[PDB]
Design a protein around this ligand. Structure first.
Ligand SMILES: [Cl-]
Ligand SMILES: [Cl-]
Ligand SMILES: [Cl-]
Ligand SMILES: [Cl-]
Ligand code: NA
Ligand SMILES: [Ru+3]
Length: 129
């Protein structure tokens, strides 16, 4: 599913991301924009053989099982395919564990390079939440 901007903001809010670990909704929406262009089916293969899945491009080296990342963990306890669903539950629940890991949203390199320190509220502007 490719989400609309406000449609994703709403879903993320409903799922408990607004100010989760202190990160306002706009941060999450910005991150999803640049990680996946709001497409739940997005995947990207990493040079190390790990793969990133879903709206927030969650990576198989630590967070999900895809059966093809040697030496990896599955800390969210889900198959990586769950991260590609139209239903964002699995991605949101897994994101909560990642953003709780110690580095905040710096775990998403695209957030740090493209959203951190920017006017992120602009991503939720004019949405009925
Ligand atoms: Cl994701
Ligand atoms: Cl694996
Ligand atoms: Cl933090
Ligand atoms: Cl940018
Ligand atoms: Na894994
Ligand atoms: Ru870690």
């Amino acid at each position: 599913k490719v989400f609309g901007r406000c449609e994703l903001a709403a879903a993320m809010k409903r799922h408990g991301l607004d100010n989760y670990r202190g990160y306002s909704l706009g941060n999450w929406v910005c991150a999803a924009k640049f990680e996946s262009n709001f497409n739940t089916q997005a995947t990207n293969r990493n040079t190390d053989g790990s793969t990133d899945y879903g709206i927030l491009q969650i990576n198989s080296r630590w967070w999900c099982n895809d059966g093809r990342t040697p030496g990896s963990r599955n800390l969210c306890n889900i198959p990586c395919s769950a991260l590609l669903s139209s239903d964002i539950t699995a991605s949101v629940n897994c994101a909560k564990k990642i953003v709780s890991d110690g580095n905040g949203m710096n775990a998403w390199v695209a957030w740090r390079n493209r959203c951190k320190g920017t006017d992120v509220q602009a991503w939720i502007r004019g949405c009925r939440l």
